[PDB]
A paper describes a structure:
ScVip1KD shares significant sequence and structural homology with HsPPIP5K2 and with the kinase domain of S. pombe Asp1. The C-terminal α11 helix of the ScVip1 kinase domain (residues 498–520) is well defined in our structure.
The balance between kinase and phosphatase activities regulates 1,5-InsP8 levels. ScVip1PD is a phytase-like inositol 1-pyrophosphate histidine phosphatase with two conserved catalytic motifs.
Numbering used by the authors: 184 to 520
């Protein structure tokens, strides 16, 4: 087809060189409709933003090492069309802000309490203004009054939650999540952790009281269908792919194939789950977005939003992603031209 324009990919090379990124970009360039503009780690890290290459349609997202604030300044200067808002990617780092945004868009989440000891989330004025556009005010908060009423019951400022419950650090990149079981289901708890992406856990019969340093979310432990979690992958508000995986929260067991990769099964989404997926993409202004959902006997709850995430090794996903990006960019060009 006729040339539509230039797709810039402003992300770390580790992500730009992924199989999905290469195969999706190849689909977009192979009929002559788009040209790719490569940034590269040396330019991103060491060159001034006024010297970064420019494009019409920009794909850009954070991963470890990416200078997000610098990329935000580039977008402010050059104003390409974007599909994943960069400023909103900052909120993925604070579970409290993510939950505030989900709530503001009527996305169901598990019951929770919060014990913040850090004064609340931090945000500069640029992030505050972006959040206001998403229905969220960033508020200072003091440490609440709290206690364990008994071994099974947490109280925070007069509201209670009964075990089992899940204690998550407010840092969205800290996966040291603790599960606290009810005494009548054997009590104790389980510490989940990650070792260079490798998930593990350990049962401790004595884990009973919350951590006393740090800031945490306490979510009701949901009894999920088949003890699984759903990994969902959006491409805008009207496309979502989903897979189940076994959760370790009950028994510590993760299922892996012989190559060490977590076993996953493609699953069909209900209409309600498709609606939730569209809401997550919209709420975070992330066209391409991964999130985790829990299925509990006919109800679904979002527990995490991970931001830019492709499905790997699925030719239909690659085709659909190229087709949807193509249509999106054609429309974006029409609006400008
Ligand atoms: N409220 C909850 N109820 C039940 N399971 C939960 C809840 N919150 C988190 N989980 C589970 O705890 C595990 C650890 O969470 P996390 O580290 O965020 O997983 P992931 O690496 O998939 O983001 C996951 O299996 C997730 O499904």
């Amino acid at each position: 087809g006729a040339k539509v324009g230039k797709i810039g990919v402003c992300a770390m090379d580790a992500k730009v060189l992924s199989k999905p990124m290469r195969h999706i970009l190849n689909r977009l360039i192979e009929h002559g409709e788009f040209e790719t503009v490569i940034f590269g780690d040396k330019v991103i890290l060491d060159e001034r933003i006024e010297n970064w290459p420019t494009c019409d349609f920009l794909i850009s997202f954070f991963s470890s090492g990416f200078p997000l604030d610098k990329a935000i300044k580039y977008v402010k200067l050059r104003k390409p069309f974007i599909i994943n808002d960069l400023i909103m990617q900052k909120i993925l780092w604070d579970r409290r802000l993510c939950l505030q945004v989900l709530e503001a868009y009527n996305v169901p989440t598990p019951p929770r309490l919060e014990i913040s000891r850090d004064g609340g989330p931090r945000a500069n004025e640029e992030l505050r203004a972006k959040l206001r556009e998403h229905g969220v005010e960033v508020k200072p908060v003091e440490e609440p009054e709290w206690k364990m009423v008994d071994d099974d019951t947490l109280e925070v400022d007069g509201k209670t939650m009964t075990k089992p419950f899940v204690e998550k650090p407010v840092d969205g990149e800290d996966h040291n999540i603790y599960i606290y079981y009810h005494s009548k289901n054997g009590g104790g708890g389980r510490r989940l952790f990650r070792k260079v992406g490798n998930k593990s856990s350990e049962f401790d019969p004595t884990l009973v009281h919350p951590r006393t340093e740090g800031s945490y979310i306490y979510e009701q432990f949901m009894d999920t269908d088949n003890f699984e979690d759903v990994k969902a992958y959006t491409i805008g508000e009207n496309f979502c792919h989903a897979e189940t995986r076994k959760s370790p929260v009950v028994d510590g067991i993760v299922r892996r194939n012989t190559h060490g990769k977590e076993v996953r099964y493609i699953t069909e989404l209900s209409d309600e789950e498709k609606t939730i997926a569209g809401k997550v993409s919209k709420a975070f202004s992330q066209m391409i977005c991964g999130f985790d959902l829990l299925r509990v006997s006919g109800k679904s709850y979002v527990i995490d939003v991970n931001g830019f995430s492709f499905v790997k090794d699925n030719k239909a996903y690659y085709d659909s992603c190229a087709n949807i990006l193509r249509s999106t960019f054609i429309e974006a060009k029409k609006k400008m031209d």
